[PDB]
Design a protein around this ligand. Structure first.
Ligand SMILES: [Mn+2]
Ligand SMILES: [Mn+2]
Lengths: 256, 256
């Protein structure tokens, strides 16, 4: 079964739109036979009915509310009120019931088994296109730790994020990534930006393991015509079609 | 003086337009006090008058003609007639009068002394934006070798270049770059693509050492109004203005 209880894939949904992503992401991990646990961090902005749909896919639906005065990140939010989503995402480090996790954004899709990511150590991530001496925070291998979590809150508090989101803050904290230990550089096929050199895709693209739907318009923002199995608007369109295939075929029949 | 005779910066001009780039690049290297030699590979498509202007900046203007039946790359050109420019560029490995060189495209500009690149070993290059598990071939540290040169011609012959240019072929040959030895990953500030995440530039951009004017429209294709010291059309415009400053101020007075 999903017998590797000490390790997990972890995602985040702040609303019902992103929950659809999480549902496709979780489904895709199970379709490729992960033995690890599946965890989604959900905010109270996700509806009760959606939370129950998430429980049909994830082993743990964990509520995170940074607006709660009892939440560990709440005092940081009062200093940095623009960082609500980021501070929520950072709660991934609080999941100390696991020795090692791979965080994945809810706008990612798994195309092959990536259980080999658990061979990696904190902080392993793939390079960001556009500024490749920063890693992209859509997919990363980390070790839950209260110490680490509080150090991240400390940084967020004192300096904010240089990009207003989590990537800036994680790159600043884990600032040795670009120059130390090549094994912490995940291959780009573990976090393949849908924005990404066409001739490079032509030769390396078939080996993609994870696609990351970056940019404003997410897969669930597309109007899908199920009849034609297409969308209305897509450089390598197979991925968006795959997303909608998983959603209509594997996600929809789960709450009945 | 330029007393480090065993090592060189090497560029390439296939015509008079690109020669203007080479002139600004060479000037910029001397303005930042390189102790290394400056070499430009020139084709016969560069005019005699331009070749003499190049001699005012470069220590060696070396003619390369792949159309010559006596050129080492000529038989490869007959197999791969679309690769003339690439095969010319590959002649950088023939410069065995030097133990180590940094190749730089004529569409690059140096902003600080980068003599520390000679601490690096073959093949050291920075990641390409867009496909960051490939290195960008605009700037790279290499060791001239006839053996290596002929192995590159062998590859070009048998497989061409996956991108129709030199980057594909150099990435295929030096295919361990992405996964082996982080010291072969030049920091992105040694080959900063003018196309490149705005908030990353805002915090890391001031430390840029070399800018690479990628894309179709090169700095010399701009109409510069010297009066206003501007151009007609530029996200971080300082670089293009710097290019034209070096050209009008330091390049033009050199042949008189
Ligand atoms: Mn994302
Ligand atoms: Mn170039």
């Amino acid at each position: 079964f999903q017998s590797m209880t000490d390790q997990a894939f972890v995602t985040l949904t702040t609303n019902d739109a992103y929950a659809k992503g999480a549902l496709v992401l979780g489904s895709s991990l199970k379709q490729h036979r992960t033995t690890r646990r599946l965890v989604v961090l959900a905010t109270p902005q996700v509806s009760d009915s959606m939370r129950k749909v998430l429980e049909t896919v994830f082993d743990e639906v964990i509520m995170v509310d940074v607006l709660d005065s009892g939440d560990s990140a709440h005092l940081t939010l009062m200093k940095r009120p623009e960082l609500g989503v980021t501070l929520t995402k950072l709660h991934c480090w609080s999941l100390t019931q696991y020795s090692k996790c791979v965080f994945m954004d809810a706008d990612t899709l798994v195309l092959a088994n990536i259980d080999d990511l658990f061979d990696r150590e904190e902080l392993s991530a793939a390079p960001d296109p556009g500024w490749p001496d920063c890693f992209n925070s859509g997919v990363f291998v980390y070790q839950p730790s209260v110490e680490t979590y509080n150090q991240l809150l400390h940084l967020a508090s004192e300096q904010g994020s240089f990009d207003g989101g989590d990537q800036g803050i994680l790159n600043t904290f884990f600032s040795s990534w670009a120059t130390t230990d090549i094994r912490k550089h995940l291959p780009f096929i573990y976090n393949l930006s849908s924005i990404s050199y066409l001739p490079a895709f032509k030769v390396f693209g078939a080996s993609a393991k994870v696609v990351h739907f970056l940019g404003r318009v997410k897969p669930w923002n597309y109007t899908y015509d199920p009849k034609t199995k297409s969308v209305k608007s897509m450089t390598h369109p197979e991925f968006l079609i795959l997303w909608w295939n998983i959603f209509t075929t594997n996600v929809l029949p789960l709450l009945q």
